[PDB]
Amino acid sequence: MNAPPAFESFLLFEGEKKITINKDTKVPNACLFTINKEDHTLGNIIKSQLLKDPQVLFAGYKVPHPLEHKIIIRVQTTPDYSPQEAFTNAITDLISELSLLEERFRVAIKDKQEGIE
Amino acid sequence: EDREVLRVIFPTGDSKVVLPCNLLRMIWNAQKIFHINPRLPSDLHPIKVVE
Amino acid sequence: MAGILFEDIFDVKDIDPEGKKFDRVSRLHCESESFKMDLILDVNIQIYPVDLGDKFRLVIASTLYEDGTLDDGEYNPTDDRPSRADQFEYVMYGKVYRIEGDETSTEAATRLSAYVSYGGLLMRLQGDANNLHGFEVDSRVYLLMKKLAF
Amino acid sequence: QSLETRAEIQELAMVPRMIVTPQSNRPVMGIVQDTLTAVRKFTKRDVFLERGEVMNLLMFLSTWDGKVPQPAILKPRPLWTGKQIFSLIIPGHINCIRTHSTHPDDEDSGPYKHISPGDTKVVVENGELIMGILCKKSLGTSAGSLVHISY
């Protein structure tokens, strides 16, 4: 047997950290974010929120190997605006859309329905 | 003279032989890299080529 | 504004040569109203609905940003300089691979054909007035198509 | 089990060095199976990609310089063609010709009828794919192939 314990798919390891940031040297003003113990559910959404932002030149993510829980996000922005701030803002923005979605949903359920609970 | 010898080498008259160093592909690279214009006059003296 | 390599208003002779025809991309066969220049060109018919009866304006340019070069590539959506005609309905970017006429004869070098490639969408022009502008060069040339007139 | 034998394997037997076989001076390995059908399907002249799909593919490439090429169609909307994205993969300036020879086009006389871009012919220059679908004839283990020219 060689199969990992299935919980090891999502629990962070005690010697690891959740995100890691490394600069790219091929082009000016760019970054590489490492997200550990995460999957397409997270990776794909953050890609779409960043591409919505018009200051972002490039955004993409790739899961380096399927057996290996980790994703990388490359983002590149204009010199006038740090790429890190776009990422933080992109999450907060996303957090805001989901919060509004949750409030509208509960209220929509609250609409003249019965057996709602 | 080389042409006459070469007919004796290949009496069946095939044009396809195995050789090192693809000369057409190298020449083709020279045109592509030096950006040689096919229309503009070349800057090359033939005796330099022969030597 | 870009230094104009070629400029004309074209009429469509046919949309399906050989007739074989395909999706998204379609091969136009055209003729310039000067009746001294010929054109064969692919266009993305899915996003630019052409018609057989349509009369097109075609322009060819060596640049977009006023006069200086653009060989940077990297399309840069962040630019906002009104240097581009951008006024045209259909624009393509591409490279020239062949150009191509009889020159063997006495003084020949008369009547000329250019082959252009816009990322795998092919183009062919015949002329003699474009003799100063056609070059087998790196990715640089732009096709701007507009209006389809009236 | 030693540094001498590890050196001898790394230098002599290692797989990027077993590529063009002396068994018949053509590559031993070229693109196979499912990818090969997907490369055919991908290089066709009708394939177009939005800014998002190109960025995603660029992200999977390895030696990518980091400069998104200008899309072959700027207007009415950004579009990259298939051949174009493929040109980022082809090394520094590898350059083939011909190798169109699938069923398509014609059994030798049709293309001479002036070359009406019948789209089969596979032309590449300065390491940039100019036209035409890729297949077993270009990428396969055939003597004249693209993989042969890279090596």
CSV table of C-alpha atoms in Angstrom, one decimal:
chain,number,residue,atom,x,y,z
A,1,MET,CA,0.0,0.0,0.0
A,2,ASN,CA,1.1,3.6,-0.8
A,3,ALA,CA,-2.2,5.4,-0.8
A,4,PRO,CA,-2.2,8.6,1.3
A,5,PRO,CA,-4.7,8.9,4.1
A,6,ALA,CA,-7.6,10.8,2.5
A,7,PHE,CA,-7.6,13.6,5.0
A,8,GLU,CA,-4.1,14.6,3.9
A,9,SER,CA,-5.8,16.0,0.8
A,10,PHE,CA,-6.9,19.2,2.6
A,11,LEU,CA,-5.3,19.5,6.1
A,12,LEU,CA,-2.3,21.8,6.1
A,13,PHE,CA,1.0,20.2,7.1
A,14,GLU,CA,2.6,21.4,10.4
A,15,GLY,CA,5.8,22.4,8.5
A,16,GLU,CA,3.9,24.2,5.7
A,17,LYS,CA,2.3,27.5,5.1
A,18,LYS,CA,-0.9,28.3,3.2
A,19,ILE,CA,0.3,30.7,0.6
A,20,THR,CA,3.9,31.6,-0.7
A,21,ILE,CA,5.0,34.5,-2.8
A,22,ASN,CA,7.9,34.5,-5.2
A,23,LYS,CA,8.9,37.1,-7.8
A,24,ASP,CA,9.3,36.3,-11.5
A,25,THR,CA,12.4,37.7,-13.2
A,26,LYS,CA,11.5,37.1,-16.8
A,27,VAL,CA,9.4,40.2,-16.9
A,28,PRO,CA,9.1,43.3,-14.7
A,29,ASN,CA,6.3,43.7,-12.2
A,30,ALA,CA,4.8,40.2,-11.8
A,31,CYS,CA,4.3,37.6,-9.1
A,32,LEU,CA,3.8,33.9,-8.5
A,33,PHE,CA,1.5,32.8,-5.7
A,34,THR,CA,1.7,29.2,-4.3
A,35,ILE,CA,-1.5,28.0,-2.8
A,36,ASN,CA,-1.0,24.8,-0.9
A,37,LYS,CA,-3.8,22.3,-0.1
A,38,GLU,CA,-6.3,23.9,-2.4
A,39,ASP,CA,-7.9,22.8,-5.7
A,40,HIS,CA,-9.7,23.9,-8.7
A,41,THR,CA,-12.6,25.1,-6.6
A,42,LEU,CA,-10.5,27.9,-5.2
A,43,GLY,CA,-8.0,28.3,-8.1
A,44,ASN,CA,-10.5,28.7,-10.8
A,45,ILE,CA,-12.6,31.4,-9.0
A,46,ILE,CA,-9.7,33.6,-8.1
A,47,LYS,CA,-8.6,33.5,-11.8
A,48,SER,CA,-12.0,34.8,-12.9
A,49,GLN,CA,-12.1,37.6,-10.3
A,50,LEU,CA,-8.7,38.9,-11.4
A,51,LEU,CA,-9.5,38.8,-15.0
A,52,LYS,CA,-12.5,41.0,-14.3
A,53,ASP,CA,-10.1,43.7,-13.0
A,54,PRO,CA,-8.9,46.0,-15.9
A,55,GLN,CA,-5.6,46.8,-14.4
A,56,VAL,CA,-4.5,43.2,-14.5
A,57,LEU,CA,-2.4,42.4,-17.7
A,58,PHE,CA,-2.3,38.6,-17.2
A,59,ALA,CA,-3.8,36.1,-14.8
A,60,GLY,CA,-3.7,32.3,-14.7
A,61,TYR,CA,-3.4,29.3,-12.5
A,62,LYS,CA,-2.2,25.8,-13.0
A,63,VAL,CA,-2.3,22.7,-10.8
A,64,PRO,CA,1.2,21.4,-11.2
A,65,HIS,CA,0.4,17.7,-10.7
A,66,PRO,CA,-3.0,16.1,-10.1
A,67,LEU,CA,-1.8,13.8,-7.3
A,68,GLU,CA,-0.4,16.9,-5.6
A,69,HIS,CA,-2.6,19.4,-3.8
A,70,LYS,CA,-1.2,22.8,-4.7
A,71,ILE,CA,-2.0,25.4,-7.3
A,72,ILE,CA,0.0,28.3,-8.6
A,73,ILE,CA,-1.3,31.7,-9.7
A,74,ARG,CA,0.6,34.0,-12.0
A,75,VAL,CA,-0.6,37.5,-12.1
A,76,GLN,CA,0.9,40.5,-13.9
A,77,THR,CA,-0.1,44.1,-13.6
A,78,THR,CA,0.8,47.6,-14.8
A,79,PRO,CA,3.8,49.3,-13.1
A,80,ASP,CA,1.5,51.9,-11.6
A,81,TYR,CA,-0.3,49.3,-9.5
A,82,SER,CA,1.1,46.5,-7.3
A,83,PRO,CA,-0.1,43.0,-8.3
A,84,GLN,CA,-0.5,42.0,-4.6
A,85,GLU,CA,-3.1,44.6,-4.0
A,86,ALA,CA,-5.2,43.3,-6.9
A,87,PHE,CA,-5.1,39.8,-5.5
A,88,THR,CA,-6.2,40.9,-2.0
A,89,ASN,CA,-8.9,43.2,-3.5
A,90,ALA,CA,-10.0,40.4,-5.8
A,91,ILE,CA,-10.7,38.1,-2.8
A,92,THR,CA,-12.5,40.8,-0.8
A,93,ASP,CA,-14.5,41.7,-3.9
A,94,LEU,CA,-15.4,38.1,-4.3
A,95,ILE,CA,-16.2,37.8,-0.6
A,96,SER,CA,-18.6,40.7,-1.1
A,97,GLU,CA,-20.4,39.1,-4.1
A,98,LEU,CA,-20.9,35.9,-2.2
A,99,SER,CA,-22.2,37.8,0.9
A,100,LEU,CA,-24.7,39.6,-1.3
A,101,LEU,CA,-25.7,36.4,-2.9
A,102,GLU,CA,-26.3,34.8,0.5
A,103,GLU,CA,-28.4,37.7,1.7
A,104,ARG,CA,-30.5,37.7,-1.4
A,105,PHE,CA,-30.9,33.9,-1.3
A,106,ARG,CA,-32.1,33.9,2.4
A,107,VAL,CA,-34.5,36.8,1.6
A,108,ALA,CA,-35.7,35.0,-1.6
A,109,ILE,CA,-36.4,31.9,0.6
A,110,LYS,CA,-38.1,34.3,3.0
A,111,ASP,CA,-40.4,35.2,0.1
A,112,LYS,CA,-43.9,33.8,0.4
A,113,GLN,CA,-42.8,30.2,0.6
A,114,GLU,CA,-43.8,27.5,3.1
A,115,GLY,CA,-41.8,24.6,4.6
A,116,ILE,CA,-38.7,26.9,4.3
A,117,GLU,CA,-37.3,25.3,7.5
B,1,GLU,CA,33.1,15.9,-64.3
B,2,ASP,CA,31.4,15.3,-60.9
B,3,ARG,CA,28.1,14.9,-62.7
B,4,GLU,CA,29.5,12.3,-65.0
B,5,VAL,CA,31.0,10.3,-62.1
B,6,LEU,CA,27.7,10.6,-60.1
B,7,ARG,CA,25.8,9.0,-63.0
B,8,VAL,CA,28.1,5.9,-62.6
B,9,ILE,CA,27.5,5.9,-58.8
B,10,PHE,CA,23.7,5.8,-59.3
B,11,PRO,CA,22.8,4.0,-62.5
B,12,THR,CA,19.2,3.7,-61.4
B,13,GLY,CA,19.1,7.5,-61.3
B,14,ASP,CA,17.7,8.1,-57.8
B,15,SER,CA,18.0,11.6,-56.4
B,16,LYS,CA,17.7,10.7,-52.7
B,17,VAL,CA,20.8,10.0,-50.7
B,18,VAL,CA,21.7,10.0,-47.0
B,19,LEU,CA,24.3,12.7,-46.0
B,20,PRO,CA,25.4,14.7,-43.0
B,21,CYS,CA,24.5,18.4,-42.5
B,22,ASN,CA,21.4,19.5,-44.3
B,23,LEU,CA,22.8,22.2,-46.7
B,24,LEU,CA,19.4,23.4,-47.9
B,25,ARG,CA,18.2,23.8,-44.4
B,26,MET,CA,21.4,25.7,-43.3
B,27,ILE,CA,21.2,28.0,-46.3
B,28,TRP,CA,17.6,28.6,-45.6
B,29,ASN,CA,18.7,29.6,-42.1
B,30,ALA,CA,21.2,32.0,-43.4
B,31,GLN,CA,18.5,33.8,-45.4
B,32,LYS,CA,16.1,33.9,-42.4
B,33,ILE,CA,18.6,35.1,-39.8
B,34,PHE,CA,20.6,37.7,-41.8
B,35,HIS,CA,17.2,38.9,-43.1
B,36,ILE,CA,18.5,38.7,-46.7
B,37,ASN,CA,16.2,40.4,-49.2
B,38,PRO,CA,15.5,38.2,-52.3
B,39,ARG,CA,15.0,41.3,-54.4
B,40,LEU,CA,17.9,43.5,-53.3
B,41,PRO,CA,21.3,42.9,-55.0
B,42,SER,CA,23.5,40.6,-52.9
B,43,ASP,CA,26.9,41.7,-51.5
B,44,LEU,CA,29.0,38.7,-52.4
B,45,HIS,CA,31.9,38.1,-54.8
B,46,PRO,CA,31.8,34.6,-56.4
B,47,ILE,CA,35.6,33.9,-56.2
B,48,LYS,CA,35.3,34.2,-52.4
B,49,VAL,CA,32.7,31.5,-52.7
B,50,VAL,CA,34.8,29.2,-54.8
B,51,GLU,CA,37.8,29.6,-52.6
C,1,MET,CA,-1.8,57.7,-37.9
C,2,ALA,CA,0.0,54.7,-39.5
C,3,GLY,CA,1.9,55.1,-42.7
C,4,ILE,CA,-0.4,53.6,-45.3
C,5,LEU,CA,1.1,50.6,-47.1
C,6,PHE,CA,-1.9,49.9,-49.3
C,7,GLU,CA,-5.4,51.5,-49.6
C,8,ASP,CA,-8.5,50.6,-51.7
C,9,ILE,CA,-12.2,50.0,-51.9
C,10,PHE,CA,-12.8,46.4,-53.1
C,11,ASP,CA,-15.7,44.5,-54.6
C,12,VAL,CA,-16.5,40.9,-54.0
C,13,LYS,CA,-16.4,38.6,-57.0
C,14,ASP,CA,-17.1,35.5,-55.0
C,15,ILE,CA,-17.3,34.1,-51.4
C,16,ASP,CA,-16.7,30.4,-52.2
C,17,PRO,CA,-13.9,29.6,-54.7
C,18,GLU,CA,-14.0,25.9,-55.6
C,19,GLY,CA,-17.1,26.2,-53.3
C,20,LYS,CA,-15.7,23.7,-50.8
C,21,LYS,CA,-16.5,26.2,-48.0
C,22,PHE,CA,-16.1,25.8,-44.2
C,23,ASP,CA,-17.1,27.2,-40.8
C,24,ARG,CA,-16.0,30.4,-39.1
C,25,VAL,CA,-13.3,31.0,-41.7
C,26,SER,CA,-14.3,31.7,-45.3
C,27,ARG,CA,-12.2,32.5,-48.3
C,28,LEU,CA,-13.2,35.6,-50.2
C,29,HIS,CA,-12.2,36.3,-53.8
C,30,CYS,CA,-12.0,40.0,-54.5
C,31,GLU,CA,-11.1,42.7,-57.1
C,32,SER,CA,-10.1,46.3,-56.5
C,33,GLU,CA,-12.1,49.0,-58.2
C,34,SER,CA,-8.9,50.3,-59.7
C,35,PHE,CA,-9.2,47.0,-61.6
C,36,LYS,CA,-5.4,46.6,-61.5
C,37,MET,CA,-5.1,44.7,-58.2
C,38,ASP,CA,-6.4,41.3,-57.1
C,39,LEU,CA,-7.0,39.9,-53.7
C,40,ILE,CA,-7.7,36.5,-52.0
C,41,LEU,CA,-8.3,36.6,-48.3
C,42,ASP,CA,-9.7,34.5,-45.4
C,43,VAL,CA,-12.0,36.2,-42.9
C,44,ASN,CA,-13.7,35.1,-39.7
C,45,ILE,CA,-17.2,35.0,-41.2
C,46,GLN,CA,-18.6,34.0,-37.8
C,47,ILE,CA,-17.8,37.4,-36.3
C,48,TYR,CA,-18.0,39.5,-39.5
C,49,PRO,CA,-20.9,38.5,-41.6
C,50,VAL,CA,-19.8,39.1,-45.2
C,51,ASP,CA,-22.1,39.2,-48.2
C,52,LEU,CA,-21.6,38.6,-52.0
C,53,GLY,CA,-23.1,41.9,-52.9
C,54,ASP,CA,-20.9,43.8,-50.4
C,55,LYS,CA,-18.3,46.5,-51.3
C,56,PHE,CA,-15.5,46.6,-48.8
C,57,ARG,CA,-12.9,49.2,-47.8
C,58,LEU,CA,-9.4,47.7,-47.2
C,59,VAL,CA,-6.3,49.3,-45.7
C,60,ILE,CA,-2.8,48.0,-45.0
C,61,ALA,CA,-0.5,49.6,-42.5
C,62,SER,CA,3.0,49.1,-41.0
C,63,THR,CA,2.0,50.3,-37.5
C,64,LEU,CA,-0.8,51.7,-35.4
C,65,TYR,CA,0.7,54.1,-32.8
C,66,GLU,CA,1.3,57.3,-34.8
C,67,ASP,CA,4.5,56.4,-36.7
C,68,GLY,CA,6.9,54.9,-34.2
C,69,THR,CA,7.3,51.1,-34.2
C,70,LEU,CA,5.2,48.6,-32.3
C,71,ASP,CA,7.5,45.5,-32.6
C,72,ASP,CA,7.1,45.1,-28.8
C,73,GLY,CA,4.2,42.8,-29.5
C,74,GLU,CA,2.3,42.2,-26.2
C,75,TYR,CA,-1.0,43.7,-27.2
C,76,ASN,CA,-1.3,45.9,-24.2
C,77,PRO,CA,-5.0,46.5,-23.6
C,78,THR,CA,-4.1,49.4,-21.2
C,79,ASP,CA,-3.2,51.8,-24.0
C,80,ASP,CA,-5.7,54.6,-24.8
C,81,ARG,CA,-3.9,56.7,-27.4
C,82,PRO,CA,-6.4,57.7,-30.1
C,83,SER,CA,-3.6,57.1,-32.6
C,84,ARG,CA,-5.5,54.1,-34.0
C,85,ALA,CA,-8.2,54.4,-36.7
C,86,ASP,CA,-9.7,51.8,-34.4
C,87,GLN,CA,-12.7,53.2,-36.3
C,88,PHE,CA,-12.6,50.2,-38.6
C,89,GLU,CA,-14.9,47.2,-38.0
C,90,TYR,CA,-12.4,44.5,-38.6
C,91,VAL,CA,-8.7,44.4,-37.9
C,92,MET,CA,-6.1,41.7,-38.1
C,93,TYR,CA,-2.4,41.4,-37.3
C,94,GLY,CA,0.1,39.3,-39.1
C,95,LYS,CA,3.3,38.4,-41.0
C,96,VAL,CA,4.4,38.3,-44.6
C,97,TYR,CA,5.8,35.1,-45.9
C,98,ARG,CA,6.2,35.5,-49.7
C,99,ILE,CA,6.4,38.1,-52.4
C,100,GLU,CA,6.5,37.0,-55.7
C,101,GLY,CA,6.5,38.2,-59.3
C,102,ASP,CA,8.3,37.7,-62.6
C,103,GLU,CA,11.7,39.3,-62.4
C,104,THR,CA,13.7,37.0,-64.7
C,105,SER,CA,13.0,39.0,-67.8
C,106,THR,CA,14.5,42.2,-69.2
C,107,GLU,CA,13.9,44.9,-66.6
C,108,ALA,CA,11.0,42.6,-65.6
C,109,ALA,CA,10.1,43.3,-61.9
C,110,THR,CA,6.7,44.2,-63.3
C,111,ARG,CA,3.4,43.0,-61.7
C,112,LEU,CA,3.8,41.5,-58.3
C,113,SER,CA,2.1,39.3,-55.7
C,114,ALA,CA,2.2,39.4,-51.9
C,115,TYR,CA,1.3,36.6,-49.6
C,116,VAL,CA,0.4,37.5,-46.0
C,117,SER,CA,-0.4,35.4,-43.0
C,118,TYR,CA,-2.6,36.6,-40.2
C,119,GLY,CA,-2.1,33.8,-37.7
C,120,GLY,CA,-3.1,31.1,-40.1
C,121,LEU,CA,-5.7,33.2,-41.9
C,122,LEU,CA,-4.0,33.6,-45.3
C,123,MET,CA,-4.0,36.5,-47.8
C,124,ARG,CA,-2.8,37.1,-51.3
C,125,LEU,CA,-2.6,40.3,-53.2
C,126,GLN,CA,-1.6,41.1,-56.8
C,127,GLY,CA,-0.6,44.5,-57.9
C,128,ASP,CA,2.3,46.7,-58.8
C,129,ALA,CA,1.6,49.8,-56.7
C,130,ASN,CA,2.5,48.0,-53.5
C,131,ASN,CA,6.0,47.4,-54.7
C,132,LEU,CA,7.5,49.8,-52.1
C,133,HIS,CA,5.5,48.3,-49.2
C,134,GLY,CA,5.5,44.5,-49.5
C,135,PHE,CA,8.3,42.8,-47.6
C,136,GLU,CA,9.0,39.2,-46.4
C,137,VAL,CA,9.5,40.4,-42.9
C,138,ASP,CA,8.7,39.6,-39.2
C,139,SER,CA,5.2,39.9,-37.7
C,140,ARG,CA,4.4,43.6,-38.3
C,141,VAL,CA,1.6,44.0,-40.9
C,142,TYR,CA,-2.0,44.8,-40.1
C,143,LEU,CA,-5.1,44.5,-42.2
C,144,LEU,CA,-7.9,46.9,-41.4
C,145,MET,CA,-11.2,46.2,-42.9
C,146,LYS,CA,-14.1,48.5,-42.4
C,147,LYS,CA,-17.6,49.7,-43.0
C,148,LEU,CA,-18.4,47.4,-45.9
C,149,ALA,CA,-19.6,50.7,-47.5
C,150,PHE,CA,-23.0,50.9,-49.1
D,1,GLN,CA,25.1,2.4,-7.2
D,2,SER,CA,28.1,4.7,-7.7
D,3,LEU,CA,29.0,8.1,-9.0
D,4,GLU,CA,30.9,6.6,-11.9
D,5,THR,CA,27.8,4.6,-13.2
D,6,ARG,CA,25.5,7.5,-12.4
D,7,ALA,CA,27.7,9.6,-14.5
D,8,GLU,CA,27.9,7.0,-17.3
D,9,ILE,CA,24.0,6.8,-17.4
D,10,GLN,CA,23.4,10.5,-17.2
D,11,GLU,CA,25.9,11.1,-19.9
D,12,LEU,CA,25.2,8.1,-22.2
D,13,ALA,CA,21.9,6.4,-21.7
D,14,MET,CA,19.5,9.2,-20.5
D,15,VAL,CA,16.2,9.6,-22.5
D,16,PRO,CA,16.6,13.1,-24.1
D,17,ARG,CA,19.7,11.5,-25.6
D,18,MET,CA,17.9,8.5,-26.9
D,19,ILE,CA,15.7,10.5,-29.3
D,20,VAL,CA,17.0,10.2,-32.8
D,21,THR,CA,17.8,6.6,-33.3
D,22,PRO,CA,20.8,5.3,-35.4
D,23,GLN,CA,18.5,2.3,-36.2
D,24,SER,CA,17.2,4.4,-39.0
D,25,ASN,CA,18.3,8.0,-38.5
D,26,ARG,CA,14.8,9.3,-37.7
D,27,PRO,CA,13.4,10.1,-34.3
D,28,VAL,CA,12.5,7.2,-32.0
D,29,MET,CA,9.7,9.1,-30.4
D,30,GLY,CA,7.2,11.7,-31.5
D,31,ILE,CA,3.8,12.8,-30.3
D,32,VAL,CA,1.4,9.9,-29.8
D,33,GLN,CA,-2.1,8.9,-29.2
D,34,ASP,CA,-4.8,11.4,-28.0
D,35,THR,CA,-2.4,14.4,-28.0
D,36,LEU,CA,-1.6,13.8,-31.6
D,37,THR,CA,-5.3,13.9,-32.5
D,38,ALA,CA,-5.7,17.0,-30.3
D,39,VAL,CA,-2.8,18.7,-32.1
D,40,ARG,CA,-4.5,18.1,-35.5
D,41,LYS,CA,-7.8,19.4,-34.3
D,42,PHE,CA,-6.0,22.5,-32.7
D,43,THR,CA,-3.9,23.8,-35.6
D,44,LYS,CA,-6.8,23.9,-38.1
D,45,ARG,CA,-7.2,27.5,-39.4
D,46,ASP,CA,-10.7,27.9,-37.8
D,47,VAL,CA,-9.7,27.7,-34.1
D,48,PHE,CA,-9.9,31.0,-32.1
D,49,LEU,CA,-9.2,31.7,-28.4
D,50,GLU,CA,-10.4,34.5,-26.0
D,51,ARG,CA,-8.0,36.3,-23.6
D,52,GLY,CA,-8.9,33.9,-20.9
D,53,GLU,CA,-8.1,30.7,-22.7
D,54,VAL,CA,-4.8,31.9,-24.0
D,55,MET,CA,-3.7,33.0,-20.6
D,56,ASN,CA,-4.6,29.6,-19.3
D,57,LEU,CA,-2.6,27.8,-22.0
D,58,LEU,CA,0.3,30.2,-21.6
D,59,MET,CA,0.3,29.4,-18.0
D,60,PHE,CA,0.9,25.7,-18.7
D,61,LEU,CA,3.8,26.3,-21.1
D,62,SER,CA,7.4,26.1,-19.8
D,63,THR,CA,9.9,28.3,-21.5
D,64,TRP,CA,7.3,31.0,-22.1
D,65,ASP,CA,9.1,34.4,-22.3
D,66,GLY,CA,6.3,36.0,-20.5
D,67,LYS,CA,5.1,38.2,-23.3
D,68,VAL,CA,1.5,37.5,-24.5
D,69,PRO,CA,1.6,37.7,-28.3
D,70,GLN,CA,-0.8,40.1,-30.1
D,71,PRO,CA,-3.9,38.2,-31.2
D,72,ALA,CA,-4.3,37.6,-34.9
D,73,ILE,CA,-7.7,39.3,-34.7
D,74,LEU,CA,-7.9,42.5,-32.7
D,75,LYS,CA,-11.4,43.6,-33.8
D,76,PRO,CA,-14.3,43.3,-33.2
D,77,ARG,CA,-12.9,41.3,-30.2
D,78,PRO,CA,-9.6,39.8,-29.2
D,79,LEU,CA,-8.9,36.4,-30.8
D,80,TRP,CA,-5.8,34.2,-31.0
D,81,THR,CA,-5.6,31.6,-33.6
D,82,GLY,CA,-4.5,28.1,-33.0
D,83,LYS,CA,-1.3,28.0,-35.0
D,84,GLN,CA,-0.2,31.2,-33.3
D,85,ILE,CA,-0.3,29.8,-29.8
D,86,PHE,CA,1.5,26.7,-31.2
D,87,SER,CA,4.3,29.1,-32.3
D,88,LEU,CA,5.2,29.9,-28.7
D,89,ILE,CA,6.1,26.1,-28.2
D,90,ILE,CA,8.4,25.7,-31.3
D,91,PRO,CA,12.0,26.3,-30.1
D,92,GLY,CA,14.2,29.4,-30.9
D,93,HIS,CA,14.0,29.1,-34.7
D,94,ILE,CA,13.4,25.5,-35.7
D,95,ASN,CA,12.3,25.5,-39.4
D,96,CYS,CA,10.7,22.8,-41.5
D,97,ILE,CA,8.8,22.7,-44.8
D,98,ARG,CA,6.4,20.5,-46.7
D,99,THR,CA,5.4,17.5,-44.6
D,100,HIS,CA,1.8,18.2,-45.5
D,101,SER,CA,1.3,14.7,-47.0
D,102,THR,CA,-2.0,13.6,-45.4
D,103,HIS,CA,-5.1,12.7,-47.4
D,104,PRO,CA,-5.9,16.4,-47.8
D,105,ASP,CA,-4.9,18.9,-50.6
D,106,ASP,CA,-4.3,16.6,-53.6
D,107,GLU,CA,-2.1,13.8,-54.9
D,108,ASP,CA,0.5,16.2,-56.3
D,109,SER,CA,-1.0,18.3,-59.1
D,110,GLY,CA,-3.7,20.4,-57.4
D,111,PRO,CA,-1.4,22.5,-55.3
D,112,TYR,CA,0.6,23.6,-58.4
D,113,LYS,CA,-2.6,25.1,-59.8
D,114,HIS,CA,-1.1,28.3,-58.3
D,115,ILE,CA,-1.3,27.6,-54.6
D,116,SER,CA,-4.7,28.8,-53.5
D,117,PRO,CA,-3.9,28.4,-49.8
D,118,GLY,CA,-5.6,25.0,-49.8
D,119,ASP,CA,-4.4,25.1,-46.2
D,120,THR,CA,-2.7,21.7,-46.0
D,121,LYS,CA,1.0,22.7,-46.5
D,122,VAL,CA,2.9,23.0,-43.2
D,123,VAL,CA,5.2,26.0,-43.5
D,124,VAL,CA,7.2,27.2,-40.5
D,125,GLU,CA,9.9,30.0,-40.5
D,126,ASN,CA,12.1,31.6,-37.8
D,127,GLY,CA,10.5,29.1,-35.4
D,128,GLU,CA,7.0,30.5,-35.9
D,129,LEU,CA,4.2,28.4,-37.4
D,130,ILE,CA,3.1,30.2,-40.6
D,131,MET,CA,0.3,27.9,-41.9
D,132,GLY,CA,-1.2,24.4,-42.1
D,133,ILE,CA,-2.3,21.5,-39.9
D,134,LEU,CA,0.2,19.4,-37.9
D,135,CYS,CA,-0.1,15.6,-37.8
D,136,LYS,CA,1.8,12.3,-38.0
D,137,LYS,CA,3.7,13.6,-41.0
D,138,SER,CA,5.0,16.7,-39.1
D,139,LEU,CA,5.2,15.5,-35.5
D,140,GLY,CA,5.5,11.8,-35.9
D,141,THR,CA,8.6,9.7,-36.0
D,142,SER,CA,9.0,10.4,-39.6
D,143,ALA,CA,12.5,11.1,-40.9
D,144,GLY,CA,11.6,14.7,-42.0
D,145,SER,CA,9.7,15.7,-39.0
D,146,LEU,CA,9.5,18.8,-36.7
D,147,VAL,CA,10.8,16.8,-33.7
D,148,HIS,CA,13.8,15.8,-35.9
D,149,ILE,CA,14.5,19.4,-36.7
D,150,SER,CA,14.5,20.5,-33.0
D,151,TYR,CA,16.9,17.9,-32.0
